[PDB]
From a paper:
Kinesins are a family of microtubule-based motors that play important roles in intracellular transport and cell division. Kinesin-1 transports cargo within cells, a process tightly coupled with ATP hydrolysis. Whereas kinesin-1 in solution is mostly loaded with ADP, ADP release is accelerated several thousand-fold upon microtubule binding.
Apo-T87A kinesin-1 was crystallized in a new crystal form following nucleotide digestion by apyrase and gel filtration to remove any trace of nucleotide. The crystals diffracted to 2.6 Å and there were six identical molecules in the asymmetric unit (r.m.s.d. of Cαs in pairs of molecules varies between 0.3 Å and 0.55 Å). In contrast, apo-T87A differs from apo-kinesin-1 bound to tubulin in a small portion of the Switch 2 containing L11 loop: a stretch between Switch 2 and the α4 helix is disordered in apo-T87A whereas interactions with tubulin stabilize it in the complex. But in apo-T87A, where the structure of L11 has changed again, the R203-E236 interaction is lost and the E236 side-chain is disordered and not visible beyond Cβ. Since it is disordered in isolated T87A apo-kinesin-1, E236 does not make any visible interaction with the P-loop and with residue 87 in particular, leading to a higher mobility of the P-loop.
Numbering used by the authors: 6 to 19, 21 to 194, 200 to 238, 245 to 324
The structure:
């Protein structure tokens, strides 16, 4: 019903072994992981050996194909520091085996476009903003610090004043990602804000003249903090995570009312999370004994989306 799939990735272990740490995690097949004799069931659990490409294949690929066919979708990344969130989501820029989910999404989009030359015409608009201290901040125009979410006549959400930049190649998309990353709020390199990257795929069919439109959101979630300006960061981070969790949970349990309005991120993502929309949540975990509570913390958060 809900269309949310939660997938958990554990990374290989070192470099770190010199500390003295154990593996702490056992896998009952490919969808369940056991820690401290407690079982956590998911839709897929990627073990240490799982390649970048099959993470993309199982987590994101069908979502991309759906957006190229007119649907909306969302992929979330969630993880405590050094869990492998960045390796999973971005990976190694121009190494194909190699690269993480976001570069593979972009390559599939453009290969499809190239393979569909004349018969389909495309316009890809990308936007990039972060939820920092409950404020919507544009990562492509530092002057736009405090933007708002609204709904149109059809109850379709949009962020007012957000930069939309036209892109025509994979490099142009990646250039845009790097520009936004430069302005993203970091501390201690923890992300202190949640960042949302939007690819809007607009197409028109040359034979039939009919139009299609699809929105793919890539959300990098800041991890929950247990702790001045860094305190306001923690309470906002945590409150917005609980708002997401409430939505995500109401959809998973089939609630007829879903509390999208209780936070800005979920208002933005209302046309792309729940309903017809396709969603994958990738939670990244360290296997080390040193981080067992963090992992167990991440795992519980992932559990909220699990029917």
């Amino acid at each position: 019903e809900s269309n949310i799939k939660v997938m958990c990735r554990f990374r290989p272990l070192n470099s770190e072994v010199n500390r003295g740490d154990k593996y702490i995690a056992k896998f009952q097949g490919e969808d369940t992981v056991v820690i401290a004799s407690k079982p956590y069931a998911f839709d897929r659990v990627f073990q240490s050996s799982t390649s970048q490409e099959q993470v993309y294949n199982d987590a994101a690929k069908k979502i991309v194909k759906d957006v190229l066919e007119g649907y909306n979708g969302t992929i979330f990344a969630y993880g405590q520091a050094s869990s492998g969130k960045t390796h999973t989501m971005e990976g190694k820029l121009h190494d194909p085996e190699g690269m993480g989910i976001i570069p593979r999404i972009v390559q599939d989009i453009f290969n499809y476009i190239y393979s569909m030359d004349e018969n389909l015409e495309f316009h890809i608009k990308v936007s990039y903003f972060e939820i920092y201290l409950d404020k919507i901040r544009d990562l492509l125009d530092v002057s736009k610090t405090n933007l708002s979410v609204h709904e149109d006549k059809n109850r379709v959400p949009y962020v007012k004043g957000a930069t939309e930049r036209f892109v025509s190649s994979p490099d142009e998309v990646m250039d845009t990602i790097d520009e936004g990353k430069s302005n993203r709020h970091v501390a201690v390199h923890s992300s202190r804000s949640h960042s949302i990257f939007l690819i809007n795929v607009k197409q028109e069919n040359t034979q039939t003249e009919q139009k299609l439109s699809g929105k793919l959101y890539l959300v990098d979630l800041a991890g929950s903090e247990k702790v001045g300006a860094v305190l306001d960061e923690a309470k906002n981070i945590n409150k917005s995570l609980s708002a997401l969790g409430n939505v995500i949970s109401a959809l998973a349990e089939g609630s007829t009312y879903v509390p999208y309005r209780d936070s800005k991120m979920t208002r933005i993502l209302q046309d792309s999370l729940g309903g017809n929309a396709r969603t994958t949540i990738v939670i990244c975990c360290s296997p080390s004994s040193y981080n067992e509570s963090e992992t167990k913390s991440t795992l519980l958060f992932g559990q909220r989306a699990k029917t």
